[PDB]
Design an enzyme around this catalytic site. Structure first.
Site, PDB file in Angstrom:
ATOM      1  CG  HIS A  70      26.385 -13.381  40.074  1.00  0.00           C
ATOM      2  ND1 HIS A  70      27.543 -12.625  40.172  1.00  0.00           N
ATOM      3  CD2 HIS A  70      26.463 -14.041  38.895  1.00  0.00           C
ATOM      4  CE1 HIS A  70      28.270 -12.806  39.084  1.00  0.00           C
ATOM      5  NE2 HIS A  70      27.643 -13.665  38.294  1.00  0.00           N
ATOM      6  CG  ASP A 121      28.031 -10.844  43.004  1.00  0.00           C
ATOM      7  OD1 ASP A 121      27.764 -11.971  43.481  1.00  0.00           O
ATOM      8  OD2 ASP A 121      28.210 -10.669  41.789  1.00  0.00           O
ATOM      9  CB  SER A 140      30.630 -14.211  36.506  1.00  0.00           C
ATOM     10  OG  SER A 140      30.334 -13.968  35.120  1.00  0.00           O
ATOM     11  N   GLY A 141      32.819 -14.276  39.078  1.00  0.00           N
ATOM     12  CA  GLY A 141      33.323 -14.997  40.258  1.00  0.00           C
ATOM     13  C   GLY A 141      34.831 -15.111  40.365  1.00  0.00           C
TER      14      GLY A 141
HETATM   15  O1  LIG Z   1      22.769 -10.103  33.336  1.00  0.00           O
HETATM   16  C1  LIG Z   1      23.765  -9.763  32.731  1.00  0.00           C
HETATM   17  C2  LIG Z   1      24.248 -10.658  31.597  1.00  0.00           C
HETATM   18  N1  LIG Z   1      25.483 -10.173  31.018  1.00  0.00           N
HETATM   19  C3  LIG Z   1      25.743  -9.847  29.756  1.00  0.00           C
HETATM   20  N2  LIG Z   1      26.996  -9.431  29.634  1.00  0.00           N
HETATM   21  C4  LIG Z   1      27.447  -9.595  30.874  1.00  0.00           C
HETATM   22  N3  LIG Z   1      28.776  -9.178  31.269  1.00  0.00           N
HETATM   23  C5  LIG Z   1      29.498  -9.670  32.346  1.00  0.00           C
HETATM   24  O2  LIG Z   1      29.084 -10.532  33.100  1.00  0.00           O
HETATM   25  C6  LIG Z   1      30.736  -8.931  32.592  1.00  0.00           C
HETATM   26  C7  LIG Z   1      31.387  -8.004  31.833  1.00  0.00           C
HETATM   27  C8  LIG Z   1      32.497  -7.453  32.498  1.00  0.00           C
HETATM   28  C9  LIG Z   1      32.612  -7.960  33.740  1.00  0.00           C
HETATM   29 CL1  LIG Z   1      33.755  -7.579  34.948  1.00  0.00          CL
HETATM   30  S1  LIG Z   1      31.433  -9.134  34.134  1.00  0.00           S
HETATM   31  N4  LIG Z   1      26.584  -9.988  31.775  1.00  0.00           N
HETATM   32  N5  LIG Z   1      24.398  -8.622  33.062  1.00  0.00           N
HETATM   33  C10 LIG Z   1      23.930  -7.852  34.101  1.00  0.00           C
HETATM   34  C11 LIG Z   1      23.458  -6.549  33.914  1.00  0.00           C
HETATM   35  C12 LIG Z   1      23.004  -5.818  35.022  1.00  0.00           C
HETATM   36  C13 LIG Z   1      22.998  -6.367  36.314  1.00  0.00           C
HETATM   37  N6  LIG Z   1      22.528  -5.613  37.457  1.00  0.00           N
HETATM   38  C14 LIG Z   1      23.353  -4.792  38.167  1.00  0.00           C
HETATM   39  C15 LIG Z   1      22.947  -4.076  39.234  1.00  0.00           C
HETATM   40  C16 LIG Z   1      21.595  -4.178  39.632  1.00  0.00           C
HETATM   41  C17 LIG Z   1      20.751  -4.976  38.944  1.00  0.00           C
HETATM   42  C18 LIG Z   1      21.178  -5.741  37.821  1.00  0.00           C
HETATM   43  O3  LIG Z   1      20.452  -6.484  37.180  1.00  0.00           O
HETATM   44  C19 LIG Z   1      23.470  -7.656  36.496  1.00  0.00           C
HETATM   45  C20 LIG Z   1      23.934  -8.368  35.394  1.00  0.00           C
HETATM   46  F1  LIG Z   1      24.395  -9.601  35.590  1.00  0.00           F
END
Ligand SMILES: O=C(Cn1cnc(NC(=O)c2ccc(Cl)s2)n1)Nc1ccc(-n2ccccc2=O)cc1F
Ligand SMILES: [Ca+2]
Ligand code: NA
Lengths: 54, 233
Positions: free
Chosen positions: B42, B88, B185-186
């Site tokens: 991603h 991912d 992330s990653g």
């Molecule tokens: O888009 C975001 C933005 N965001 C806000 N807060 C976050 N937190 C983090 O990235 C982490 C927290 C702990 C971790 Cl380990 S990684 N992402 N988060 C999501 C939520 C849900 C999802 N998601 C999961 C499964 C299927 C579909 C789908 O959309 C992806 C995301 F990136």
């Protein structure tokens, strides 16, 4: 020996093969003569923190 | 990283940072060898062009040990999709090799069966990165790490508003305000066994960061060990 008790005394990987424990090591390590320990073959073997300055 | 601590000198040497066109870090990676970086698929959709920095602990200070490497090949998992966040995972091959040194060393890839029986059954793993210090916050200029408990799959599924596949696992805390976050992330989730650190996860996603009743979701690296080997040729 069993891998479920003290990891078969292995430093790294343990498997029970032909009904017997065998140890092994990641790339960059050689299994010691005692068949348990893992000996780095280089100064920056995987998975070691870099704590001794060279 | 929300909570946790600054990673001490030499203690997070497998950390890589992907750096975008604004020159900013936007994702982490894990050093696997002189030529290969592990990251999340991603992350590839978040910048059109990027490089990889290793050996950095402080993005505002030139320590002298840092290096930037260009990417030669991107190997994205063919089953990754943004709709599911499943699979991912990606490997990068660098144009020029890393020289291992202080703060630059690879994490180990474990054998799958042993990883499942011995690493994934540990109480905790370690996540690290330069990501935000709270959900809505800014990224850390300093590399942080955090011990995160493994969370059982049944609990993980119940807590999630999205489908947790078998290629995912939860780690972290129900209510304690400590978690990874966006920007991490990653990056690496590693598990310690007798003073050696093995790659067990990739920081993947979360519903916010450190929310009550939510966990950090990670790519289950055990499910991809043969895939990583093939990707690294
Ligand atoms: O888009 C975001 C933005 N965001 C806000 N807060 C976050 N937190 C983090 O990235 C982490 C927290 C702990 C971790 Cl380990 S990684 N992402 N988060 C999501 C939520 C849900 C999802 N998601 C999961 C499964 C299927 C579909 C789908 O959309 C992806 C995301 F990136
Ligand atoms: Ca620096
Ligand atoms: Na939580």
């Amino acid at each position: 020996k069993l891998c479920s008790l003290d990891n078969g005394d292995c430093d790294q990987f343990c498997h029970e093969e032909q009904n017997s424990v065998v140890c092994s090591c990641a790339r960059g390590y050689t299994l010691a003569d005692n068949g348990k320990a893992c000996i780095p073959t280089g100064p920056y073997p995987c998975g070691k923190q870099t704590l001794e300055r060279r | 990283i929300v909570g946790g601590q600054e990673c001490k000198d030499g203690e997070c040497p497998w950390q890589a940072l992907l750096i975008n066109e604004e020159n900013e870090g936007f994702c982490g990676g894990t050093i696997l060898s002189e030529f290969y970086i592990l990251t999340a698929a991603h992350c590839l959709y978040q910048a059109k062009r990027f490089k990889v920095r290793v050996g950095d602990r402080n993005t505002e200070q030139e320590e002298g040990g840092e290096a930037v490497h260009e990417v030669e090949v991107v190997i994205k998992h063919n089953r990754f999709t943004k709709e599911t966040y499943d699979f991912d995972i990606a490997v990068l091959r660098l144009k020029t090799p890393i020289t291992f040194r202080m703060n630059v060393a690879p994490a180990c890839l474990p054998e799958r069966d042993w990883a499942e029986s011995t690493l994934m059954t540990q109480k905790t793993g370690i996540v690290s990165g330069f990501g935000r210090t709270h959900e809505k916050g800014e990224q850390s200029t300093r590399l942080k790490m955090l011990e995160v408990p493994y969370v059982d799959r049944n609990s993980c599924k119940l807590s999630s508003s999205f489908i947790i596949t078998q290629n995912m696992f939860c780690a972290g805390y129900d209510t304690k305000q400590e978690d990874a976050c966006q920007g991490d992330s990653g990056g690496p989730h590693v598990t310690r066994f007798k003073d050696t650190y093995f790659v067990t996860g990739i920081v993947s996603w979360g519903e916010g960061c450190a929310r009550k009743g939510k966990y950090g979701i990670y790519t289950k690296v055990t499910a991809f060990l043969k895939w990583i080997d093939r990707s690294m040729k």
